[PDB]
Structure formats: structure tokens, C-alpha cells
């Protein structure tokens, strides 16, 4: 008997994974939508107004001036760390290069399990304290969720270290896989940077093609929520084939590949490893 | 990735039988398995579902508290344990697989890889 609100599908999965069925969920940003910006509906205003706790990633995902989340917590009359809690904290954080930003953060910390664990522990920390005598199982579900993520994190690191220093490269469109690269020993290469930039211009396309002409991944990959035509040409006008799709923005719907945080990561980790290994 | 349901056929009311869904194709480690049942006269129901992460969910209230889904990856087999069976449960049970997933599609959905099911009924079971 506790009202909880998640700002997105990844948080909602990590939360459902901790409570099983004990707490009352709401996930504000739906599958396929970008938690980066979404206009809240009256339904989101009321479920946050009646919330006991609200969780969000922040770290320049949804915690700025025009960020939808910020407006929601004030026109709904709420306060920080009593009503709402940030999750992406304690993470081995990447500051956005930011030539035009000069001191802001990169939100994609869930693209590795090394930090994915932190998110699940932080969601649990501000849920257990808030549901004390009914806590019971939350501690177990956390140990298990983390144990599974950690198992996989360890499998992933090994799978990458065993391929090649000269083949390992994550070739993406939007360069959101920065976190992936640190945890797993493999740098990314992008057409464009995270949402500070424009997309698909010739000075981005030919820069990525030069790197492909110079170093040699066996495959290129595309994101779930993205227009594939740009990558399609860095592959076809000059390059190696596209092998699979990879998950970034959200959790897939049930039965589809990547329908849980663990699952979107199992998919990425297996498909990226195979694309470069082969 | 080529499934058979073994398990068992009919029992008496109050009985218990374990259904067993096993792969004769390729590695079921990366798949969610759901059991569904289709009655001789009613719609398919989700019975239970075990995911990639070995997380489990139960989809139909009519069977909750009785049915259990579990896995043993050594044999690529998931088991559905029935308990305290009643005539309301007589149906063809079958399993299906869904890739890189923790959760099953709706019972209404076209299912991707189902096996030929197992007819399970509940009755006198002797002269």
C-alpha cells in the first residue's frame, strides 16, 4: 500500500524487479518515447501528486530547465528528497565533452552493468526505508537482481577482453554508448554526439567513414529508436555490414527482445560481442 | 528452439502433475517460456511465464496459488508444476518461446515458437 512513480521504462523495470507486486507503479515515459523530453499528462500530474516516492535518472537526462520532470514537480507542489529521488548517483560519471555546454553531464549510465547495479540499489534504498515492516522481500530481490546483473557484467567483460584490441569498436549513430565503452574495454565511434548537436551532416558521415577506412570492426550497429538511413550509408557507400540493432532509449514491450533491463542488456551484450567477434 | 511438451495426461481431482517443456533445437537460455492452455471450447489463457533472467510471472488469476514455473538450464527444460487440480483446469497445455525476453506476449498474440501441446484432464482415472 505505497504509491510509486518512475519517470521511465528502465526505472519501472528495476523497480518492478524489486517489489514483485508489493508497490503501486506508474511509469511516466512510455516505451519507445524519449525520457529526455515528454509532455506530462494530467494522469502523470495526479499520480505524482499522490506519490509517496518518485524516482528519476536525472544527470542531464530529465533534470534541467525545460525538462518535463522539473516542471512537473513544481506545478504539482513537490520537494526534493522527501517526495522525489534521483537515481543516477555514485556512478562512475561521464561529463559531457560539452564544447558549447562547458560543465554538464552524460545520462547514459545504464548502458553498462557496472553502473546498472547502482541504479537498482539506489531505487531499492529509498523504497525499503519507506515500506519498513512490509520490506521483508525487497532485500532478497535486490541481492538477486544485482547478482544476476553482476553475473552478466562479468560475462560481458570477459567476452570483450577475449576478442581483439584492434577490432573492438562500438559503431553507433548517436554516441550514447560512452558508458558501455568504459566498463567493457571497447571505445565507441559515432556519427553525432548526444542531444547538443545536429544529425547526419557530411562532416559527421565522412569522419566516421574515414575511421572505418582506417580501423576495422567486423560490423556496424544501430539503435532501437533511430532512423537507420545514416548508418545504412556509412555501411553501404563505404563499409562493412550492419549486424543487428541495439537498445538505448527504453525497454521493449513484453515478449520482444529487450523487454527488461536485464534483457535489453543481454541482447546488446550478446549481439555486440558477436558482431565484433565474427 | 524446436519444443516438445512431455509432462503428463489426465489426473484425479486434487492431483498434481508436472509438465515439461524441453528444447530439441538450440539453447533455451536466451528465451522466455510461457505455458498457455487452450480449453476444448474456451480461449487460450496464459498459465505462467519464466523469463531470460529466471524471473517468473503468473498471468491468470484462475490458476494462481496452484501453478509453478521453474527452470533447469542443464537440460534446456522448464517445468510447470500443477497442484490441487480441479476440472476447471482440463485443457491442452503447451509452451512457447520468445527471444531475449523476461515476459510473455498476450495469450491472444500469435505465438512464435509453440510445441505440440499436451492434453491434460481431471477425472475418476480408474474403473
Curated annotation (Swiss-Prot), chain A:
A Pfam family of this chain: ZnuA
GO MF terms, alphabetically ordered: metal ion binding
Compartments in which it is found: Cell membrane
Keyword entries, A-Z: Cell membrane, Ion transport, Iron, Iron transport, Lipoprotein, Membrane, Metal-binding, Palmitate, Signal, Transport
Binding site for Fe(2+): 36, 108, 174, 249
Entry's Gene Ontology cellular component terms: plasma membrane
Membrane topology: Lipid-anchor
A GO biological process held by the record: cell adhesion
Effect of residue 36 to A: 46-fold decrease in affinity for Fe(2+). 100-fold decrease in affinity for Fe(2+)
Variant or mutagenesis effect after changing residue 249 to A: 18-fold decrease in affinity for Fe(2+). 100-fold decrease in affinity for Fe(2+)
Top-level taxon in the UniProt lineage: Bacteria
Major subcellular site: membrane
Record-linked PANTHER family: HIGH-AFFINITY ZINC UPTAKE SYSTEM PROTEIN ZNUA-RELATED, METAL-BINDING PROTEIN HI_0362-RELATED
Function in brief: Part of the ATP-binding cassette (ABC) transport system MtsABC involved in iron import. Binds iron with high affinity and specificity and delivers it to the membrane permease for translocation into the cytoplasm. Has low affinity for Zn(2+) and Cu(2+).
Family: Belongs to the bacterial solute-binding protein 9 family. Lipoprotein receptor antigen (Lrai) subfamily.
This protein's name: Iron ABC transporter substrate-binding lipoprotein MtsA
Name of the gene: mtsA
Amino acid at each position: 500500500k505505497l504509491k510509486v512513480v518512475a519517470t521511465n521504462s528502465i526505472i519501472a523495470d528495476m523497480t518492478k524487479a524489486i517489489a514483485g507486486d508489493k508497490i503501486d507503479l506508474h511509469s511516466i515515459v512510455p516505451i519507445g518515447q524519449d525520457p529526455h523530453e515528454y509532455e506530462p499528462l494530467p494522469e502523470d500530474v495526479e499520480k505524482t501528486s499522490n506519490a509517496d516516492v518518485i524516482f528519476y535518472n536525472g544527470i542531464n537526462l530529465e533534470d534541467g530547465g525545460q525538462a518535463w520532470f522539473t516542471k512537473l514537480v513544481k506545478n504539482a507542489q513537490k520537494t526534493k528528497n522527501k517526495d522525489y529521488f534521483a537515481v543516477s548517483d555514485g556512478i562512475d560519471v561521464i561529463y559531457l565533452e560539452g564544447a558549447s555546454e562547458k560543465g554538464k553531464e552524460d545520462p547514459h549510465a545504464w548502458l553498462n552493468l557496472e553502473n546498472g547495479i547502482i541504479y537498482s540499489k539506489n531505487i531499492a534504498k529509498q523504497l525499503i526505508a519507506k515500506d519498513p515492516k512490509n520490506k521483508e522481500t525487497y532485500e532478497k530481490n535486490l541481492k538477486a537482481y544485482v547478482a544476476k546483473l553482476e553475473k552478466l557484467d562479468k560475462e560481458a567483460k570477459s567476452k570483450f577482453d577475449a576478442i581483439a584490441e584492434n577490432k573492438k569498436l562500438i559503431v553507433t549513430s548517436e554516441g550514447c554508448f560512452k558508458y558501455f565503452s568504459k566498463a567493457y574495454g571497447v571505445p565507441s565511434a559515432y556519427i553525432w554526439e548526444i542531444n547538443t548537436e545536429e544529425e547526419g551532416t557530411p562532416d559527421q558521415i565522412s569522419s566516421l567513414i574515414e575511421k572505418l577506412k582506417v580501423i576495422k570492426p567486423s560490423a556496424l550497429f544501430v539503435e532501437s529508436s533511430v532512423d537507420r538511413r545514416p548508418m545504412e550509408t556509412v555501411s553501404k557507400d563505404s563499409g562493412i555490414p550492419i549486424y543487428s540493432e541495439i537498445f538505448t532509449d527504453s525497454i521493449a514491450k513484453k515478449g520482444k527482445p529487450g523487454d527488461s533491463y536485464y534483457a535489453m542488456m543481454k541482447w546488446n551484450l550478446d549481439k555486440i560481442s558477436e558482431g565484433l567477434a565474427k | 528452439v524446436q519444443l516438445v511438451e512431455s509432462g503428463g495426461g489426465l489426473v484425479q481431482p486434487g492431483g498434481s502433475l508436472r509438465l515439461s517443456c524441453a528444447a530439441s533445437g538450440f539453447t533455451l537460455d536466451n528465451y522466455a517460456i510461457g505455458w498457455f492452455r487452450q480449453a476444448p471450447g474456451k480461449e487460450r489463457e496464459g498459465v505462467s511465464c519464466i523469463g531470460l533472467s529466471a524471473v517468473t510471472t503468473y498471468d491468470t488469476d484462475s490458476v494462481k496459488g496452484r501453478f509453478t514455473i521453474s527452470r533447469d538450464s542443464a537440460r534446456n527444460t522448464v517445468y510447470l508444476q500443477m497442484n490441487s487440480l480441479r476440472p476447471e483446469d482440463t485443457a491442452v497445455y503447451f509452451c512457447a518461446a520468445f527471444p531475449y525476453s523476461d515476459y510473455c506476449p498476450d495469450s491472444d498474440d500469435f505465438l512464435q515458437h509453440r510445441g505440440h501441446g499436451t492434453q491434460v484432464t481431471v477425472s475418476s482415472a480408474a474403473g
